[PDB]
């Protein structure tokens, strides 16, 4: 039940282990039945800001005149 993800290496050691292998991976295993007990995975996604930045009914191009 182990989950193996890879790390985003910031500072690199003068090793090939700093660039590949299990040496740039980390392992995770959940010990509790309730999902609330789990830690945060932090592999979180993003989205389009459009719902806030452009909640416009009739879609407009920046090059084209906004007021038409």
């Amino acid at each position: 039940g182990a989950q193996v993800s890879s790390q985003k290496v910031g500072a690199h050691e003068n090793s090939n282990r700093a660039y590949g292998g299990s040496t740039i991976n980390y392992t995770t295993i959940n010990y509790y039945r309730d999902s609330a007990s789990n830690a945060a995975s932090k592999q979180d996604f993003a989205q389009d800001p459009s719902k806030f930045t452009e909640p416009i009914k009739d879609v407009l191009i920046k090059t084209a005149p906004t007021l038409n």
Binding site: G10, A11, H12, E13, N14, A18
Partner: protein, 272 residues
């Protein structure tokens, strides 16, 4: 971190190739080996440079600060983060101009009664809060700033193994500068001398922020003092541009000197 080459046997010579002669004016070092100037035997080399790698050279926890708090404003202290408060780690780092690494901080906490026969207190818990440049600095050992909703804090219980945390490469440049030949401001023509003046060799006024330390327990009239010794170890190290090491005593955060300007002893030219 590897092997050294074997010594190959070398016999006598009588040739027009003269590796012994050179010209150091070029700026190069003559890459001679014993067999170039003497007769050698074959030696199978087993020694390695495993311990002199840049990583192994720095792979030690060095003391960078001793923060003190008196639990009877001294109920809390603030330490501006730096590696220049001590000399040993600083001198090693300064063998290079730039560096890039992660840091491991270990905190050794000690405390004691000032009085041999007076006072008593229950076990102390310490809070080590990191205040990134910009965050509000505590004015009292118990004001709102200690809520740490965003600042990283470490709560240490006296007597437990030394606390330890890791910090990533946090520089705003692509590498840490051990030396900065410049200013943070350029004085412009026309402005008052008070204007555009800044320290030589200084970048940001607040580079990495500081640590605020306090004892969380309610203070008792008992006289107590605690000291937090901060140890830092660079891990995952890369360094650039070697420099000669510091020969005379340090005189501040800069390359300034003043006192021990005559480091070498006397020795006869023809005395072994």
């Amino acid at each position: 971190a590897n092997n050294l080459p074997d010594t190959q046997s070398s016999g006598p010579a009588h040739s027009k190739e003269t590796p012994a002669l050179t010209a150091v004016e070029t700026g190069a070092t003559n890459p001679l080996v014993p067999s170039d100037t003497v007769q050698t035997r074959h030696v199978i080399q087993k020694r390695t440079r495993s311990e002199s790698t840049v990583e192994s050279f720095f792979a030690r926890g060095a003391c960078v600060a001793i923060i003190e708090v008196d639990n009877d404003s001294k109920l809390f202290s603030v330490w501006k983060i730096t590696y220049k408060d001590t000399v040993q780690l600083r001198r090693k780092l300064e063998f290079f101009t730039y560096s890039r690494f992660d840091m491991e901080f270990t905190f050794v906490v000690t405390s004691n009664y000032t009085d041999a026969n007076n006072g008593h207190a229950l076990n102390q818990v310490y809070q080590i809060m990191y205040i990134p440049p910009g965050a509000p600095i505590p004015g009292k050992w118990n004001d709102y700033t200690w809520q740490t909703s965003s600042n990283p804090s470490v709560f240490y219980t006296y007597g437990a193994p030394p606390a330890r945390i890791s910090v990533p490469y946090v520089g705003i440049a692509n590498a840490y500068s051990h030396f900065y030949d410049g200013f943070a401001k350029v004085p412009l023509a026309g402005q008052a001398s008070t204007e555009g003046d800044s320290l030589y060799g200084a970048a940001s006024l607040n580079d990495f922020g500081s640590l605020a330390v306090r004892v969380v327990n309610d203070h008792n009239p008992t006289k107590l003092t605690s000291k937090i010794r901060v140890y830092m170890k660079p891990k995952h190290v890369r360094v650039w541009c070697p420099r000669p090491p510091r020969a005379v005593p340090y005189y501040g955060p800069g390359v300034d000197y003043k006192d021990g300007l005559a480091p070498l002893p006397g020795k006869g030219l023809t005395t072994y």
